[PDB]
Design a protein around this ligand. Structure first.
Ligand code: WKF
Ligand code: WKF
Ligand code: WKF
Ligand code: NI
Ligand code: NI
Ligand code: NI
Lengths: 126, 125, 125, 126
């Protein structure tokens, strides 16, 4: 039912070599796994998110976001990343994102809790 | 059972008057609803996220994040916010966050697609 | 002269205990020194920036920003912070900011080069 | 002189087609002009900033940042952008940045005051 449900669902790769496997639901849900090529991370991590299942009709992208907490059956980095961005369809579909990575900190170190960055995902590895 | 499952589960209010109702699952899931006091938003929106269910024991906070897409059965703002932050428990429990709000845009307007801000959530209004 | 030249010029303090000493010029310049209470920083660092010297008259704040490179005669942290925000006048004047701290990194580590945060500066603290 | 004073100094273009003309001083200063290809912007705006004039020698980039207030003799957008990033010298020199654009707002609209994005600058015009 989602306008971009079929386009979003599948396997995506970012510029770092990370792998993002996602199913878009008709209700706006995103569910899948994330494997990071960098950082204190090994194997797949659960991800969950949301996307706009009825986007604008003027050629705009489709807003979405998702979260990974960096704990799985191998490691725990005591941190979580959220990606905020939009899906852009067409011949070379892309999910363009900016992200925030927060680590658990003491109060004294809270000022340095959060990294910001940007990831671009494609359906073919770069 | 997640270490902070009981502390996170419940209702949170930010500095703007928005309301965040969340259930923390034993496996690290966050599920619930968000009601925003500002912006193109009315009634409740679905939220989903994750939290660290086995955090450090050194006094550090508990890392977490969640997403809301601003579409429900009443409105659609063609946008989505992600909050990234940490839960700090105790008498004056807090969830301290930074957030990214992306709107769907044309490619030419993508440079102005994403707002950044910070929200602090407490257990009282 | 700048509309908020006199209001911005002076000594400001943020929530961490850092001190921001600034002169606003009639031409939109910001020039001064920054002393950070946290991080790889000791004593004062040069700052430079810009502000809107003819802001809106509808009660809106005054947009501004400035940079500190964390090198002085005593230390070098191989990093730089930019604060982006707005000055809000009145009995309880504030400069509300969000900031980006970038450290020099190898290309392999570029994904972790930049912190984001927020500081609120007041004239009393 | 700064290690990268000669390398940073010059004319740069980002992926939007904006033009960044900058002079790096031996004292860590950045001065120059910015012309944006997008937004409420016309002609050149004053910029000022700072860079690390004695960076690490381990292959790391050179940290820097600069500000533009979007007021000149032609327009006033009641806004300011700060770019935070690092200069990477060598083959295909690049300045990689993330930026924050804050507009003056009323207190009720302060939550919507700030955009975030990322710009990459090279000396080759797109
Ligand atoms: O595809 C992809 N992959 C990437 C992108 C986006 S997700 C990303 C993959 C993430 C996989 C998990 N990577 C771990 C993160 C936590 C870690 C670390 O290196 N943290 C940090 C390093 C440098 C700067 C930081 C600033 C703020 C906070 N963290 C920063 C760490 O231990 N942090 C800390 C431990 C203990 C105390 C801390 C106190 C303050 C801050 N951090 C602390 C170890 C590596 N896209
Ligand atoms: O008033 C105030 N005060 C505060 C606020 C806003 S300004 C702030 C005061 C700043 C004073 C300078 N503080 C130094 C920063 C550089 C330092 C460090 O701790 N860096 C980092 C720590 C944690 C997370 C990081 C994420 C990304 C990158 N850095 C993070 C460091 O050595 N970093 C690094 C060294 C070598 C290689 C690196 C590779 C990647 C990242 N960092 C590297 C040492 C402390 N408001
Ligand atoms: O090279 C390059 N170029 C680009 C990049 C990085 S710099 C960039 C060039 C910038 C040149 C100036 N462009 C003006 C900015 C202000 C403007 C606008 O579109 N603002 C905004 C549009 C969309 C989202 C916003 C979110 C938050 C705030 N602004 C957003 C505007 O009028 N904003 C406002 C006016 C009145 C009230 C406001 C209240 C809240 C927020 N904004 C308000 C008009 C265009 N790299
Ligand atoms: Ni960390
Ligand atoms: Ni650092
Ligand atoms: Ni604006």
């Amino acid at each position: 039912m989602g306008r971009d449900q079929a386009g979003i669902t599948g396997t995506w790769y970012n510029q770092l070599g990370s792998t993002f496997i996602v199913t878009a639901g008709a209700d706006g849900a995103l569910t899948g796994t994330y494997e990071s090529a960098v950082g204190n991370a090994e194997s797949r991590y659960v991800l969950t998110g949301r996307y706009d299942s009825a986007p604008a009709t003027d050629g705009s992208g489709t807003a979405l976001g998702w979260t990974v907490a960096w704990k799985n059956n191998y490691r725990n980095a005591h941190s979580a990343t959220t990606w905020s961005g939009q899906y852009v369809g067409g011949a070379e579909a892309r999910i363009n994102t900016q992200w925030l990575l927060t680590s658990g900190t003491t109060e004294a170190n809270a000022w340095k809790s959060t990294l910001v960055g940007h990831d671009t995902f494609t359906k073919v590895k770069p």
